[PDB]
Amino acid sequence: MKLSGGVEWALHCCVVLTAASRPVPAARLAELHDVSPSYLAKQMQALSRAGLVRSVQGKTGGYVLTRPAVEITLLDVVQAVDGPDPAFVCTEIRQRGPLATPPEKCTKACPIARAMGAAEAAWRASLAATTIADLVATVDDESGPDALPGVGAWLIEGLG
Amino acid sequence: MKLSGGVEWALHCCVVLTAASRPVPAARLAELHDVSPSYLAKQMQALSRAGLVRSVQGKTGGYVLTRPAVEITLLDVVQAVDGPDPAFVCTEIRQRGPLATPPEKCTKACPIARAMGAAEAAWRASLAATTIADLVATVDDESGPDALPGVGAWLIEGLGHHHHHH
Ligand code: FES
Ligand code: FES
Numbered sequence: 224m225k226l227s228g229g230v231e232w233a234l235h236c237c238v239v240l241t242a243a244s245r246p247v248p249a250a251r252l253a254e255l256h257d258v259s260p261s262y263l264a265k266q267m268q269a270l271s272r273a274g275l276v277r278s279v280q281g282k283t284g285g286y287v288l289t290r291p292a293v294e295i296t297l298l299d300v301v302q303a304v305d306g307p308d309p310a311f312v313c314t315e316i317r318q319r320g321p322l323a324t325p326p327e328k329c330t331k332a333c334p335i336a337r338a339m340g341a342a343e344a345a346w347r348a349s350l351a352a353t354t355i356a357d358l359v360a361t362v363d364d365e366s367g368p369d370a371l372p373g374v375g376a377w378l379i380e381g382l383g
Numbered sequence: 384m385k386l387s388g389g390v391e392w393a394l395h396c397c398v399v400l401t402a403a404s405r406p407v408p409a410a411r412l413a414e415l416h417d418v419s420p421s422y423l424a425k426q427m428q429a430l431s432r433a434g435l436v437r438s439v440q441g442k443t444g445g446y447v448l449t450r451p452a453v454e455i456t457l458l459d460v461v462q463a464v465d466g467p468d469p470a471f472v473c474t475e476i477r478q479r480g481p482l483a484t485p486p487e488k489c490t491k492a493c494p495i496a497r498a499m500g501a502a503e504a505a506w507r508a509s510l511a512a513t514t515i516a517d518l519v520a521t522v523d524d525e526s527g528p529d530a531l532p533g534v535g536a537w538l539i540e541g542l543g544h545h546h547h548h549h
């Protein structure tokens with residue numbers, strides 16, 4: 224199964240933005256992670272279209288989270304970058320060939336499609352149960368309480 | 384996310400092979416699902432490499448399941464076709480840039496990596512909990528108990544006849 228390569232970068236960007244007390248340009252986030260500015264901007268633009276970040280305009284501008292970290296799930300961020308479409312796409316092959324499912328018996332989804340859907344629901348539910356706030360609390364505990372504030376200070380420095 | 388297109392066909396083939404009392408050629412499975420025999424043979428070869436089917440040789444050969452339906456999970460079939468590699472691969476981006484987390488504090492996997500790994504473990508656990516036998520029981524209930532036996536009869540009908548009239 225393939226997942227958008229943007230997900231790692233986008234989740235890291237959401238975590239460090241919680242520590243920024245002012246808007247952070249995409250270029251500064253890109254410098255932090257030593258990644259293509261253009262590539263990271265595309266991920267921030269996907270987060271913007273999903274209403275998770277807002278681009279504040281001006282030379283004092285850059286990205287901010289649109290709501291508290293506790294209200295942003297990992298599923299919110301992953302679906303922003305990877306998309307909401309199901310991984311398993313049923314193309315109704317049960318309706319093909321000489322012993323095709325009777326048309327009146329196609330009101331329920333294929334049992335195979337339903338089983339694949341249940342697995343995707345388990346993946347989504349796992350991501351929905353964790354927030355950016357949860358990731359921050361883990362980083363505080365594992366890296367220490369000054370790790371993310373240090374990143375935050377670095378991200379906003381030179382602006383004020 | 385995105386799964387290999389062969390998965391839908393492969394799962395359907397495993398279900399209908401439970402109803403067949405003799406080997407079923409890829410071309411006969413392909414006729415049942417109205418699909419290119421070469422395309423379907425590619426999916427059956429993936430199932431063969433994973434040890435889930437065997438291609439029996441000779442005039443009355445074809446594919447057979449290698450163990451009972453209750454011993455074949457959806458995860459077995461999906462990994463056979465789509466592959467076992469994780470969807471999310473951590474590339475240790477925490478170890479990049481001017482504030483890079485040094486290895487000393489990288490004794491554990493990144494919290495983000497652990498969360499993504501937990502979600503994939505949940506997807507795998509769901510697919511591992513359902514067998515081909517479970518799908519057959521659902522079909523028996525929803526299509527009626529003659530549906531899959533009828534498919535099995537059709538799949539084995541007139542096998543070994545390859546010299547068709549001009
Ligand atoms: S018709 Fe699509 S999974 Fe069965
Ligand atoms: S370093 Fe890879 S997910 Fe955080």
Ligand SMILES: [Cl-]
Nearest residue numbers: 241291292293
């Ligand atoms: Cl916050």
